[PDB]
């Protein structure tokens, strides 16, 4: 009992009193010579998982990720919070977020496995020698998972902004989002998780009514290059070859996208 610890993740939900959270979900923890090896391997593995996560979280201190206890990290989101804790079986029926806590848990482990695949590949192919790794670069565990959520939030606000500044102003308009040596056995295994590790991006195309002289076209693309922040790309062209304009823009701040959307709709889209 000295140190035999596994990790579970619990999810907290914020409520309408708005002051504090409460617990809406929790991941389960399941209970010869090879069997003692098995338990010892699953033990070291999870201790590694918490170690690396703790290291990655150093980068995320600005993004709502707090490292509180040496065995616990808390990830704060507007309507939810996540706790990832490495704990023994002495301390501490189903519910809403149990399923999600279990998924985040399996995903966490899987992310470490991919890290293992990468180090090994890094060793197989290039070095004739030893690995080289960066926390910022190849250690991604929290970022890919958390990023999926933060992006969804970001995409929500963006659509709100678009409704206000554009959809409500110009009557016919609407919006449509669109999807943007032989080690090969290894690359195929890692490629399979590109789904989880790809930097998130969606393109929001704004449909505008066709003026009979010219057809204006506007679209925005949202992306999270470092997984936790947002970039907004706006392209506008309403060509009349006498009046023809083209804008290609990039913004890190929703405040400026409102100002630029306003500018655009004002001059070019409005009657």
């Amino acid at each position: 009992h000295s140190v035999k610890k596994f990790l579970r993740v619990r999810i907290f939900t914020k409520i309408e009193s708005e002051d504090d959270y409460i617990l809406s979900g929790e991941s389960v923890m399941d209970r010869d010579i090879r069997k003692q090896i098995q338990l010892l391997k699953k033990i070291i593995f999870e201790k590694e998982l918490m170690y690396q996560i703790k290291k990655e979280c150093a980068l995320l201190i600005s993004y709502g990720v707090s490292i509180e206890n040496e065995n616990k990290v808390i990830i704060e989101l507007p309507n939810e919070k996540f706790e990832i804790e490495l704990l023994s079986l002495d301390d501490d029926l189903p519910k809403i977020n149990d399923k999600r806590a279990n998924l985040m848990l399996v995903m966490l482990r899987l992310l470490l496995v991919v890290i293992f695949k990468k180090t090994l590949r890094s060793r197989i192919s290039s070095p004739h020698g030893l690995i080289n790794l960066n926390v910022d670069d190849d250690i991604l565990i929290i970022r890919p998972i958390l990023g999926k959520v933060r992006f969804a939030n970001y995409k929500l606000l963006l659509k709100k902004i678009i409704k206000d500044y554009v959809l409500d102003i110009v009557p016919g308009s609407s919006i449509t989002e669109t999807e943007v040596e032989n080690i090969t056995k290894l690359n195929k295994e890692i490629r399979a998780f590109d789904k989880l590790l790809n930097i998130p991006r969606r393109e929001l195309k704004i449909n505008l009514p066709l003026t009979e002289h010219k057809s204006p076209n506007l679209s925005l693309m949202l992306e999270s290059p470092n997984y936790c922040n947002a970039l907004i790309h706006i392209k506008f062209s309403a060509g009349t070859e006498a009046n023809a304009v083209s804008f290609d823009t990039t913004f890190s701040d929703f405040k400026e996208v409102e100002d630029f959307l306003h500018f655009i709709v004002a001059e070019y889209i409005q009657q």
Partner: peptide, 19 residues
């Protein structure tokens, strides 16, 4: 073998998705 670990988790994951 880490490919063994991965198969464990995927098994675990598909099982959660389809109990």
């Amino acid at each position: 073998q880490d490919t063994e670990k991965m198969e464990e988790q995927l098994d675990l994951l598909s099982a959660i998705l389809d109990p």
